[PDB]
Amino acid sequence: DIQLTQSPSSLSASVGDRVTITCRASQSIGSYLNWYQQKPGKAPKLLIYAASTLQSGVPSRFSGSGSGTDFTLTISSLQPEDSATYYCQQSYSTPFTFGPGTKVDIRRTVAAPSVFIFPPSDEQLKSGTASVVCLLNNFYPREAKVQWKVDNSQESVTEQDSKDSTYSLSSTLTLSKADYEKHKVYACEVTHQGLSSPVTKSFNRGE
Amino acid sequence: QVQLVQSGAEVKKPGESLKISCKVSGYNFASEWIGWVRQMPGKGLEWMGIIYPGDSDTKYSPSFQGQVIISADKSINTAYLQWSSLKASDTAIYYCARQNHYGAYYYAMDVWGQGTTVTVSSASTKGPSVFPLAPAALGCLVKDYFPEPVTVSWNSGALTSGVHTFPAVLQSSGLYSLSSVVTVPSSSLGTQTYICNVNHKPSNTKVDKKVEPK
C-alpha cells in the first residue's frame, strides 16, 4: 500500500507570489501522479495528470513536474481564488491513494469588519427563544473578539472569500423569551486590529 | 457537457443499510471507469474503489473490501455505493467521480459529482425553523435542525454576490443552526424582493422565507 506525504501542510502567501508544493511517494511511481484542487464546500477539480500534463480549462499559472519519488506543484502567480486545499494522488497501482493535503491561504492588507446587528424576529419570540446576531463583514485577518453585554453565545466564521480574500463572522446570542424581556439594551462590542478603537453596535427593544 | 448528479443527503441509524446513487450524463457511460471517494468530517480524501460499468469489474482498496459494495446499472447510466450495516465512522461526504484514461494507461479523476452527505446517528431527523434577519445587510436564521446539511440560496439563485452562508454550529441541544446573509444597497430595501431558499434534504423540507425591514 503506497503512502504519500505533502509539504508544507499549510501555507499563506500574498497575491502574485510564487508557491511550490511537494509530493513524496513511498516508492518510485514514475510520472503516475495527479494534483487536485478543492475549495471549501465544493467538490474537487483535476488540475494536473501524469505529473506535468495540465487539464483543459485550468489556468496557465498552474504547473507540475517531477518523477520517481519527488513531485512539485507550482502556482506562478497566486490569485485570490486560488486559496484552496490541494491534494496529490498516485495512479501507478491500486489503491490510488491520495496525499494528506495542503491548505493555501491568502495574505492581503488588514481590513476592518463592517459590523451589523439583527434584533430577534417577533415570529421567533412567539416560539419561545430569542437569538441576537452580530455580523462582522469582510475583514482580515480571521482573528477577532466579540462580547455581548446587557446593561450562552456561539460563533461561526466563513472561509476565505475567493474574490477579495476576506473572512466574515457571525455571533448569535441566545436566550429564552422570559430572560430576553427582562432587559432593555443589547449590544455587541468588536475588537479588531484594523479598528483603531472598539466598535459598538446596539439596539433598544422595539421599533 | 459531462455532469454527474449524485443523490441527496441521507441520515441512517447505525446497523441500517444504505444505497447512494450517482446519475451520469454527457459521455458513453459503459466506456470509462467510475469511482467513489470518501471524505470524513474535517479530513482529507480517501480512495474507496472504482468500477468499470461495462463488465461490472470492481477494484476496491483493501480498507473497504467486504465493508462496502460498488455496483452499476448501465441501463440508466447510474452507479451505486452500498452498505449492509452502517457504522458511526461511516459518517462522511461521498464523492462520485469519473476516472478518465489518458495515453498501463494514465488514470485520473477529471469530473466529480456534487457529493452526498451521509450522517449515521440514532438521533431522529429534524426539519429547520427559519426566521428573518430584518435589516445594508439582511439574512435568514436557520435553527434547530438535524442532521447536516442545509443549503441556502437567495431569490432562487439570482442573488449570489455578497452572500455569506456560515458553517453550522452544534447547539447544546444536539441540533444544528446556521445563518445566511447578503449585503445589498440600502436603496433597494423598499424596491427589491429578498427571499432565502432553505433546503434540507434529510427532512424532506424546503423553506422559502421573504425578508422585510423592521
Side-chain angles (χ1 to χ4, degrees), chain A residues 101-138:
Chain A
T102 73
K103 177 57 183 180
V104 170
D105 301 307
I106 296 298
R107 196 188 78 92
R108 53 166 284 101
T109 66
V110 177
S114 310
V115 187
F116 302 83
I117 185 172
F118 303 91
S121 66
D122 287 314
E123 178 187 4
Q124 179 182 26
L125 285 178
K126 200 178 184 179
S127 302
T129 62
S131 299
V132 188
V133 170
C134 190
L135 161 67
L136 323 192
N137 211 62
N138 296 340

Side-chain angles (χ1 to χ4, degrees), chain B residues 27-48:
Chain B
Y27 77 98
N28 186 340
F29 179 68
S31 290
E32 301 283 5
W33 289 83
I34 294 260
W36 289 92
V37 179
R38 161 176 145 171
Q39 189 174 35
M40 274 173 41
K43 304 290 295 175
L45 303 184
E46 290 176 85
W47 190 87
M48 280 192 295

Side-chain angles (χ1 to χ4, degrees), chain A residues 31-32 34 36 38 43-44 49 55 91 95-96 118 121-124 135 137-138 154-158 161 168 207, chain B residues 39 44 47 61-62 95 99 102 104 106-109 112-113 131-134 137 164 166-167 169-170 183 209 214:
Chain A
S31 67
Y32 294 93
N34 311 294
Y36 305 90
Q38 190 198 11
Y49 59 92
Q55 176 75 1
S91 51
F96 299 128
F118 303 91
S121 66
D122 287 314
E123 178 187 4
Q124 179 182 26
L135 161 67
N137 211 62
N138 296 340
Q154 254 172 339
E155 309 188 11
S156 174
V157 49
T158 72
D161 196 271
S168 296
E207 177 188 344
Chain B
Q39 189 174 35
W47 190 87
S61 295
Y95 296 104
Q99 185 133 80
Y102 304 87
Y106 283 100
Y107 299 97
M109 284 171 166
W112 293 64
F131 308 110
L133 292 188
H164 287 325
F166 295 95
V169 299
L170 189 57
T183 62
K209 194 67 165 186
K214 271 173 168 292

Side-chain angles (χ1 to χ4, degrees), chain A:
Chain A
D1 216 305
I2 300 182
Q3 307 293 318
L4 296 175
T5 63
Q6 300 177 192
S7 67
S9 308
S10 53
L11 65 86
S12 180
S14 52
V15 185
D17 269 346
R18 188 186 184 99
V19 160
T20 76
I21 304 170
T22 70
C23 193
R24 300 187 59 172
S26 47
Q27 291 173 329
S28 179
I29 63 178
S31 67
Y32 294 93
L33 182 109
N34 311 294
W35 289 98
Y36 305 90
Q37 176 212 152
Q38 190 198 11
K39 294 193 294 183
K42 303 290 179 300
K45 287 172 52 185
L46 178 61
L47 294 182
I48 288 177
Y49 59 92
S52 62
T53 311
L54 190 64
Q55 176 75 1
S56 63
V58 179
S60 48
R61 62 182 179 273
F62 291 93
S63 63
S65 66
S67 181
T69 61
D70 289 44
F71 305 84
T72 65
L73 170 60
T74 298
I75 313 176
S76 300
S77 183
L78 267 190
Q79 297 300 312
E81 59 268 5
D82 294 354
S83 174
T85 306
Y86 296 85
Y87 299 101
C88 82
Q89 176 202 217
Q90 61 91 6
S91 51
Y92 184 74
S93 69
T94 60
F96 299 128
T97 45
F98 281 97
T102 73
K103 177 57 183 180
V104 170
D105 301 307
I106 296 298
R107 196 188 78 92
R108 53 166 284 101
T109 66
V110 177
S114 310
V115 187
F116 302 83
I117 185 172
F118 303 91
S121 66
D122 287 314
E123 178 187 4
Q124 179 182 26
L125 285 178
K126 200 178 184 179
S127 302
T129 62
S131 299
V132 188
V133 170
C134 190
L135 161 67
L136 323 192
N137 211 62
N138 296 340
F139 60 92
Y140 181 86
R142 190 172 44 189
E143 182 185 311
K145 188 177 188 179
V146 297
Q147 291 188 337
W148 289 104
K149 288 174 293 182
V150 182
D151 61 356
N152 290 325
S153 177
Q154 254 172 339
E155 309 188 11
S156 174
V157 49
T158 72
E159 198 46 54
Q160 194 168 44
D161 196 271
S162 278
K163 292 291 180 287
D164 289 345
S165 300
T166 57
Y167 301 82
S168 296
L169 186 142
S170 75
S171 181
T172 300
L173 201 273
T174 60
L175 300 172
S176 58
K177 187 188 74 64
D179 283 306
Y180 174 72
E181 294 175 359
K182 294 178 182 182
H183 305 266
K184 186 178 180 182
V185 186
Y186 293 84
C188 88
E189 185 179 340
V190 171
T191 56
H192 192 249
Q193 72 188 239
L195 296 172
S196 56
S197 56
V199 174
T200 312
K201 295 273 182 153
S202 176
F203 76 90
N204 59 80
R205 299 170 63 196
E207 177 188 344

Side-chain angles (χ1 to χ4, degrees), chain B residues 146-157:
Chain B
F146 193 97
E148 282 281 63
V150 302
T151 63
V152 194
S153 75
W154 288 91
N155 292 339
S156 314

